[PDB]
Amino acid sequence: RIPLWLVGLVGGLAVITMLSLFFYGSYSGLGSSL
Amino acid sequence: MTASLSNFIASLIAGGVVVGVIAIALIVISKSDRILR
Amino acid sequence: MTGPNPNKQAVELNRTSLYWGLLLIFVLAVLFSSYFFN
Amino acid sequence: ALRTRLGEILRPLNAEYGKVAPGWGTTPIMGIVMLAFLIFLVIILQIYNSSLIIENVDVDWANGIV
Amino acid sequence: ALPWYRVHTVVLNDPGRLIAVHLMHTALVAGWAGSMALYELAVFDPSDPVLNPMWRQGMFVMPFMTRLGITDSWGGWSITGESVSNPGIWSFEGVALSHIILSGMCFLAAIWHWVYWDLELFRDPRTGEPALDLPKIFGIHLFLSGLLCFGFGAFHVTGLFGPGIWVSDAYGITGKVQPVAPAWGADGFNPFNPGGIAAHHIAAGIFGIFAGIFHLTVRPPQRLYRALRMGNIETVLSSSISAVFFAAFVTSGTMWYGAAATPIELFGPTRYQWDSGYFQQEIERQVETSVSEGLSESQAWSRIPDKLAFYDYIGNNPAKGGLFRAGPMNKGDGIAEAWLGHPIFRDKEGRELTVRRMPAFFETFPVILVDKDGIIRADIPFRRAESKYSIEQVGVTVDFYGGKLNGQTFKDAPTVKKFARKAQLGEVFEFDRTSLESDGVFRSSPRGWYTYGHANFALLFFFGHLWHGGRTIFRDVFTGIGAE
Amino acid sequence: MEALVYTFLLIGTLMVIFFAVFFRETPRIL
Amino acid sequence: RGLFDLVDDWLKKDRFVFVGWSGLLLFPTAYLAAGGWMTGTTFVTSWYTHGLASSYLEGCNFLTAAVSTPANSVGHSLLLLWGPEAQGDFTRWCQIGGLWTFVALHGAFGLIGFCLRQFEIARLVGIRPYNAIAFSGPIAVFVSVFLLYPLGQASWFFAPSFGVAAIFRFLLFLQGFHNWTLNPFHMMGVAGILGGALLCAIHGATVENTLFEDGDAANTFRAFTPTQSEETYSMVTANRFWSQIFGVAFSNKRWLHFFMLFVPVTGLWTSSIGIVGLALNLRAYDFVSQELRAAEDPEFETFYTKNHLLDEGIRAWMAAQDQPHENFVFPEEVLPRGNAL
Amino acid sequence: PLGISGTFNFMLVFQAEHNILMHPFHMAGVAGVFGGSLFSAMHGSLVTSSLIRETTENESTNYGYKFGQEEETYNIVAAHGYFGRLIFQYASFNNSRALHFFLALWPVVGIWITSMGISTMAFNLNGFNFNQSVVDSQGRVINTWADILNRANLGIEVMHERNAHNFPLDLA
Amino acid sequence: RPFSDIITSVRYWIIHSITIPSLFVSGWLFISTGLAYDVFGTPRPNEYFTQDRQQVPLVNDRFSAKQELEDLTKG
Amino acid sequence: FRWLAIHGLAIPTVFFLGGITAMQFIQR
Amino acid sequence: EVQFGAYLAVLLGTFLPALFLVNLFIQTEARKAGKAGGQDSD
Amino acid sequence: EVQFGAYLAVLLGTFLPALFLVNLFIQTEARKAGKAGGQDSD
Numbered sequence A: 001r002i003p004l005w006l007v008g009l010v011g012g013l014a015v016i017t018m019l020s021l022f023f024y025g026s027y028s029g030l031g032s033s034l
Numbered sequence B: 001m002t003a004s005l006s007n008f009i010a011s012l013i014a015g016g017v018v019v020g021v022i023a024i025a026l027i028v029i030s031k032s033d034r035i036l037r
Numbered sequence C: 001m002t003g004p005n006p007n008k009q010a011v012e013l014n015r016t017s018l019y020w021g022l023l024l025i026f027v028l029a030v031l032f033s034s035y036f037f038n
Numbered sequence D: 001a002l003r004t005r006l007g008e009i010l011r012p013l014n015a016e017y018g019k020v021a022p023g024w025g026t027t028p029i030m031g032i033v034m035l036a037f038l039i040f041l042v043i044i045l046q047i048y049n050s051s052l053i054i055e056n057v058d059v060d061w062a063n064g065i066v
Numbered sequence E: 001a002l003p004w005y006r007v008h009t010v011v012l013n014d015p016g017r018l019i020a021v022h023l024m025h026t027a028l029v030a031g032w033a034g035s036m037a038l039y040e041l042a043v044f045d046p047s048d049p050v051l052n053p054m055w056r057q058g059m060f061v062m063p064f065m066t067r068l069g070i071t072d073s074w075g076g077w078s079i080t081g082e083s084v085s086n087p088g089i090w091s092f093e094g095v096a097l098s099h100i101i102l103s104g105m106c107f108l109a110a111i112w113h114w115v116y117w118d119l120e121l122f123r124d125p126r127t128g129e130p131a132l133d134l135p136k137i138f139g140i141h142l143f144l145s146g147l148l149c150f151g152f153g154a155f156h157v158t159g160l161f162g163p164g165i166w167v168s169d170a171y172g173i174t175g176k177v178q179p180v181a182p183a184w185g186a187d188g189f190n191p192f193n194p195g196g197i198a199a200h201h202i203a204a205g206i207f208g209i210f211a212g213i214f215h216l217t218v219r220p221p222q223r224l225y226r227a228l229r230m231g232n233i234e235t236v237l238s239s240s241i242s243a244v245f246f247a248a249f250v251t252s253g254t255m256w257y258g259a260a261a262t263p264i265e266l267f268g269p270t271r272y273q274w275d276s277g278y279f280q281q282e283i284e285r286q287v288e289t290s291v292s293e294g295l296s297e298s299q300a301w302s303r304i305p306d307k308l309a310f311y312d313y314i315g316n317n318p319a320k321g322g323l324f325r326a327g328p329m330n331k332g333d334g335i336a337e338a339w340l341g342h343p344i345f346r347d348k349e350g351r352e353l354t355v356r357r358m359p360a361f362f363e364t365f366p367v368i369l370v371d372k373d374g375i376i377r378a379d380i381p382f383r384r385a386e387s388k389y390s391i392e393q394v395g396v397t398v399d400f401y402g403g404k405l406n407g408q409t410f411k412d413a414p415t416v417k418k419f420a421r422k423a424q425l426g427e428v429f430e431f432d433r434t435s436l437e438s439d440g441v442f443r444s445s446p447r448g449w450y451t452y453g454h455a456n457f458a459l460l461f462f463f464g465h466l467w468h469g470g471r472t473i474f475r476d477v478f479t480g481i482g483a484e
Numbered sequence F: 001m002e003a004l005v006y007t008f009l010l011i012g013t014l015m016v017i018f019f020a021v022f023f024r025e026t027p028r029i030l
Numbered sequence G: 001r002g003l004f005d006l007v008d009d010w011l012k013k014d015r016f017v018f019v020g021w022s023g024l025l026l027f028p029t030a031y032l033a034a035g036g037w038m039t040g041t042t043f044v045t046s047w048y049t050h051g052l053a054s055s056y057l058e059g060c061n062f063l064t065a066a067v068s069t070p071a072n073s074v075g076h077s078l079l080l081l082w083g084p085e086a087q088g089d090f091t092r093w094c095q096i097g098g099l100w101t102f103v104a105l106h107g108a109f110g111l112i113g114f115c116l117r118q119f120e121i122a123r124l125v126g127i128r129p130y131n132a133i134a135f136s137g138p139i140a141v142f143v144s145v146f147l148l149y150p151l152g153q154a155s156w157f158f159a160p161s162f163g164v165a166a167i168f169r170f171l172l173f174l175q176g177f178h179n180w181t182l183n184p185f186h187m188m189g190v191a192g193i194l195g196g197a198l199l200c201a202i203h204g205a206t207v208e209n210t211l212f213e214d215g216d217a218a219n220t221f222r223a224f225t226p227t228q229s230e231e232t233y234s235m236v237t238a239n240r241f242w243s244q245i246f247g248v249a250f251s252n253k254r255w256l257h258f259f260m261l262f263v264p265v266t267g268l269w270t271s272s273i274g275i276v277g278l279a280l281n282l283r284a285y286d287f288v289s290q291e292l293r294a295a296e297d298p299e300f301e302t303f304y305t306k307n308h309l310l311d312e313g314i315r316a317w318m319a320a321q322d323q324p325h326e327n328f329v330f331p332e333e334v335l336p337r338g339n340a341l
Numbered sequence H: 001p002l003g004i005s006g007t008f009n010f011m012l013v014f015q016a017e018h019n020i021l022m023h024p025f026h027m028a029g030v031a032g033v034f035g036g037s038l039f040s041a042m043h044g045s046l047v048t049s050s051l052i053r054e055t056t057e058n059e060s061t062n063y064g065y066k067f068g069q070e071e072e073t074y075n076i077v078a079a080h081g082y083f084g085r086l087i088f089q090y091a092s093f094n095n096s097r098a099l100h101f102f103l104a105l106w107p108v109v110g111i112w113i114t115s116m117g118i119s120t121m122a123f124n125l126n127g128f129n130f131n132q133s134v135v136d137s138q139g140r141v142i143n144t145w146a147d148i149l150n151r152a153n154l155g156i157e158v159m160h161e162r163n164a165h166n167f168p169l170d171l172a
Numbered sequence I: 001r002p003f004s005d006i007i008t009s010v011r012y013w014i015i016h017s018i019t020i021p022s023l024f025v026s027g028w029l030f031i032s033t034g035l036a037y038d039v040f041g042t043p044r045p046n047e048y049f050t051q052d053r054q055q056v057p058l059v060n061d062r063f064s065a066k067q068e069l070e071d072l073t074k075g
Numbered sequence J: 001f002r003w004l005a006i007h008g009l010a011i012p013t014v015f016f017l018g019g020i021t022a023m024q025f026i027q028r
Numbered sequence K, L: 001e002v003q004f005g006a007y008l009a010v011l012l013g014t015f016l017p018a019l020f021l022v023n024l025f026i027q028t029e030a031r032k033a034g035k036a037g038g039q040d041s042d
């Protein structure tokens, strides 16, 4: 048994590591106009 | 008999097995999951 | 002739649905006039 | 309920109403026709679309005989 | 207590007045086609069927009479131009007057069939309630349409007992009503083959004869009589509409893309004959063979008919008109008079410059002169200050060949700019814009209007398939649903 | 001559707005 | 009993997702339209068809990625995977733009299969089928734009590509070349979309502000059990409110909720009729009485003639890069510029 | 401009000078009125689907509602079980109050956000600009859909107020 | 079984602690090994332009479109 | 069983997100 | 220059359908006054 | 050359008064069907 709010916490900050990774590569790599 | 006509009948056979493997799988599972009277 | 039809009904239109249908025609007349006059 | 002379002739055509063939009947015969007519419409569309090329059939304005 | 949108549902349980209504729609359709064709003969002018055909004069139903074999009129003129002493009964006036007489008789029959609604024919002999045996009514009415299909293709079309179909050549020069022998092979499904039309209505008429022989004798199954609700009459209407917009996408399709059933001598050219350069490449091909047979250039362009260059004109494209502008195409720029010729542009260096042509999208298009390899050599500049490719610099001279400007050469910039602007519009013609008060914007051909109505209709009838269809299946719950 | 039709359509539309507000069929309980 | 009855009873069984008969048409075709879009916007380029970049491999974000329409040389080919163009190769099928017709065709049979889903569930639950008839609205916008609009045009190239900014150019391509905003069918469509958003914002805010006291809590969301027969808001009050604010008001809940169906859906049907009229280039481009006057009088200016000069800028400036197949090489001196811009 | 053609002179010139379509607040209100007209016709259909029999087939459907009645005029359990099978079970509001609140939330929040798109673009804080954003390793500009959208904006920018400008940049 | 009772269970996270990283890394290796450029034919950043072909490549034929893309993708 | 219903949508989604995180670190 | 068939389009597009909808209202109120039996039925 | 305001004179001189006289007949028959009380009164 795992508390449900721990599950939404770890997956919720996992999405932030996915989203902010996508806004990172808007300023670096391809499609960055550097 | 052309390139275009031979490839189309092969797609018609391929269009038969796509309907087929859906239908054959659907008859078998409809036997097992019948509803009690 | 033959007998009276048992499928006679009556038509209704209340005062509410009059103003819808009037305003429907005038607004379509305002909209489509400018194109018809060209 | 007014007998007319033309009404007497056509009366056996309307005298049946709602007789059915019991069971599934000729339904599997119909579907083989409908599967066939589905293939027919696919073929004559792809001839027209030039996505099914038949030898000595060219979809272009042809010299009709004058 | 009916609402205004349910007033015509008193005919649901009344077969005797179902006919009198369906005869009255027929008396209005037939009275339209008679009175439309009488209106078109007061407007038509058979002065020049080469530069003023029937599709320039906005004739809509008139290319449907000439498609199935009507060329003469009681005035003595003909669309083929050959004179006639007597067209008999079936001329343009004879057809128009006979669709009127048919309208007046379907009118009087609908007064009978409305008054005498109570006939024993429509009663059930087992219950007494008014019923229609919809499986056998379909057997009769499909067997009749097998005969009128097979009878049409075998007798009217093939010229056994009929005139035949309007056929034509590939480039819309020659065309005449003639019998068409059917093509039974895979070449019948070439839609530009007129033999496929004869082979269709002969073959598919037989299938419609012997389907009515089936659908008379064999009764429906118990499952399909309940599943498709064949006791209800609205399942006929739900599925008849599906067989009617489906037919209307096809006819609007083959009108717009072209078929042998839509000749470009009657409805006008398609837009795909402008996009591919279908007439530009053909006029050059009849000059490439003329010049190769030892000719001067102006004698080569003089062999080109005025009709062939008239299709090479952007004002005959149906994709140039507008919606709320009205009238014939002659209202566009006037009745054409003559062909001004084929201008050929040459610079001071002497190379040949072709004017870049306007596509069908562009209402406005800048005049650009391009040589053979694609390099921009001259134009008419918007901004005249920093000009590097103007006609004054390049020194473009114009040379006409054929037409009424046959051997002429204009060399100055005022005159060359006037012919460079009118050469991006296809060929160059002299019009008569004072007869019909022609304003100066392009209209559409009857090819364009037919595709408009019968494809906006077919989209609306798709909603009628879903309304009347879902009204058939769900019939027990249209007062509402039960709370239990 | 042309703008006379446009004005008649506009003030004619404002008439049926006036009659719909003040001469409305007043709904009543029971 | 029979074989048909066992299959009919299995599909209609209560389960997680209702399958039914219509799920055999929906679930295969909708899964491949959606997955064909996610693949085509991620991996497949537009470098050979349009000469663009429309993938995530090519640096485009969510906005500038698309599944793009094929070349003009393809014409209106269906671009079958086994066809004469692709000839069985998957890689050359993607580069021609074969995924776009794959998305549009399997998507068109998803909207068929989803509208059949709404007739099937309504017959089992036992209700009137107005969801399936209101969903016919969005069917008339998919068909008459993604299908019937490129059919009337030169090829599939002039269709909306399935991407966010690729719709946005289709909005701009349709003003300069067609004058779409002048068309009365868009004008009756904006009246239904902004009219439909109006009705749910009012009916949302009037039900929620005439609620009854059914509890002592300050939260009013808690005080509603779903199976209760008492109405949850005072219709007499809400009528009395709007009869004095706006002047006229609904006195009929059956007429109200039907009117919330009619207004959004009709704006999708009337706007769908006009876009069929632009497949044929029957556009409402000009008022000729405005155009004949502005030609003879070089002082008469309206807002309407100001929009034509904005459309010459759309027809000239983008059409060089819009249509690389036609090879428009415009000089600098033909492009209409204004003063000092 | 207070008119109809003046509105589209306003919208197109606002596109060239501010790039509203790429701005995420016009994006959040297109979602407000497409969503608003969705949930309007989605709520208005599920009430009209589940009406209770109170009329005959001859008279109108609407006359089964007497004004000011206290009985509920539609089976709300029926329309909940329909939409509970049309998508799945847990996506359906059984609460009619929370349902009639979501109809008021979605458009109004979508138009608050949109009207503060025009406001923040009144002070020349324009929408996104992805022009010349994709380059190869050589450095040549690879076009995107935003570059095609840019050439539509450049056509309106060089043509709006074709006489009012004297200097190379439309600062106003 | 209810959905929230699944993801809170340990046996769920026993299975999906192996399958998620074994499937996310396979989506990484699908790109970093250069495989996605060859299945879908997407140009690498090296190969939008070539030494010979300096213009924008377009398909200009209905039926030999497969053969023309064999031309424009070799160099 | 519903393991075929979710994992037809989730097994692709994690696979593509494995590729979209890899494309952030690809440069010229 | 305007099209002179547009006056016939608009002014019959107004009047003919709008005079139709008036008739369905007048006979509606006549049936209600017809059944009511007082001073107006006749 | 004819006067283009005469089409509006004639076709409204026909239709507007003739559609008026139809309305007085339809509400006449509705009052007679209103009092009669059978199948059409409502």
Ligand code: CLA
Pocket (backbone or CB within 6 Å): E004, E005, E006, E007, E008, E009, E237, E241, E460, E461, E462, E463, E464, E465, E467, E468, E471
């Ligand atoms: C084959 C054609 C056909 C036929 C025979 C019917 C027959 C019927 N329909 Mg149906 N329908 C059709 C097509 C057809 N429909 C199409 C295409 C649609 C989609 C638009 C509909 C949508 C529809 C709805 C939504 C409803 C019906 C209803 C009805 C029934 C009564 C009609 C009525 O009271 O209208 C009476 C109409 C009037 C008094 C005036 C209508 C005025 C129109 C809008 C403008 C004038 C018409 C114009 C002159 C026509 C030009 C010709 C053009 C068609 C080419 C009747 C069974 C009703 C029903 O279900 O019955 C209970 C109903 O509610 N139909």
Ligand code: CLA
Pocket (backbone or CB within 6 Å): D041, D044, D045, D048, E183, E184, E188, E189, E190, E191, E196, E197, E199, E200, E201, E203, E204, E207, E208, E246, E249, E250, E253, E254, E259, G143, G147, G148
């Ligand atoms: C000797 C054999 C023979 C021959 C040579 C023909 C010859 C022909 N038949 Mg025919 N036919 C025959 C026997 C024959 N028939 C028999 C035995 C039957 C059974 C009764 C038919 C039934 C039949 C039908 C039903 C049709 C033909 C058609 C045709 C024409 C095909 C070329 C063409 O223009 O189609 C063009 C091809 C199509 C139009 C394909 C139809 C597919 C539809 C349009 C798809 C779209 C449907 C959808 C609702 C539209 C909206 C979606 C939108 C987004 C696109 C040609 C005249 C077609 C025709 O008359 O068109 C002029 C046609 O529609 N035939």
Ligand code: CLA
Pocket (backbone or CB within 6 Å): E026, E027, E029, E030, E032, E033, E034, E037, E061, E062, E064, E065, E068, E095, E096, E099, E102, E145, E146, E149, E204, E205, E207, E208, E209, E247
């Ligand atoms: C007595 C018979 C008769 C004859 C010989 C004609 C003759 C003519 N009519 Mg006319 N007409 C008639 C009766 C007749 N009319 C009646 C009774 C009406 C009222 C409904 C009309 C209404 C009418 C109109 C509105 C028009 C004509 C027109 C024409 C002319 C061209 C016909 C044409 O292109 O149609 C082409 C016909 C079709 C394309 C019909 C196709 C049938 C569909 C595809 C059937 C498909 C379903 C099928 C049943 C399924 C089963 C198939 C089975 C075999 C397998 C021609 C002179 C045209 C004209 O120029 O008028 C002056 C025109 O526009 N007619």
Ligand SMILES: CCCCCCCCCCCCCCCC(=O)OC[C@H](COP(=O)(O)OC[C@@H](O)CO)OC(=O)CCCCCCCCCCCCCCC
Pocket (backbone or CB within 6 Å): C014, C016, C017, C019, C020, C023, F013, F014, F016, F017, F020, F021, F027, G245, G246, G247, G248, G249, G250, G251, G252, G255, H062
């Ligand atoms: C200073 C502020 C004072 C208030 C200002 C008043 C303006 C109010 C406008 C009146 C609406 C009249 C339309 C009649 C309509 C009519 O009478 O309907 C009456 C109808 C009442 O329906 P019931 O529930 O009575 O109907 C039950 C059944 O009988 C149905 O038939 O009320 C509504 O549904 C109207 C709600 C939508 C209101 C539609 C308004 C659309 C805006 C106007 C569009 C035209 C503007 C054109 C200008 C060129």
Ligand SMILES: CC1=C(/C=C/C(C)=C/C=C/C(C)=C/C=C/C=C(C)/C=C/C=C(C)/C=C/C2=C(C)CCCC2(C)C)C(C)(C)CCC1
Pocket (backbone or CB within 6 Å): E028, E029, E031, E032, E035, E100, E101, E102, E103, E104, E105, E107, E108
């Ligand atoms: C009685 C009689 C007679 C007579 C008859 C007649 C003379 C007829 C006529 C008829 C007619 C002459 C009719 C007509 C009709 C028409 C119609 C019916 C039309 C309509 C149309 C419509 C309505 C349309 C609409 C529209 C429009 C307008 C626009 C666009 C859209 C649409 C298309 C929708 C005779 C002597 C022979 C014989 C004896 C008896």
Ligand SMILES: CC1=C(/C=C/C(C)=C/C=C/C(C)=C/C=C/C=C(C)/C=C/C=C(C)/C=C/C2=C(C)CCCC2(C)C)C(C)(C)CCC1
Pocket (backbone or CB within 6 Å): A015, G031, G032, G034, G035, G036, G037, G038, G039, G102, J009, J012, J013, J016, J017
């Ligand atoms: C194409 C094709 C194919 C395939 C198909 C399929 C199988 C597909 C699938 C696919 C899929 C089906 C896909 C999916 C994708 C997904 C994605 C990739 C997603 C993403 C997501 C995101 C990114 C989002 C975000 C977010 C979050 C996470 C949270 C918060 C919110 C938001 C929204 C922001 C085949 C083989 C048939 C062949 C033919 C062609």
Ligand code: OEX
Pocket (backbone or CB within 6 Å): H013, H017, H160, H161, H164, H170, H171, H172
């Ligand atoms: O005023 Mn109205 O539009 Ca706003 O940008 Mn600057 O200013 Mn004028 O130019 Mn562009």
Ligand SMILES: [Fe+2]
Pocket (backbone or CB within 6 Å): G203, G257, H043, H047, H100
């Ligand atoms: Fe509600």
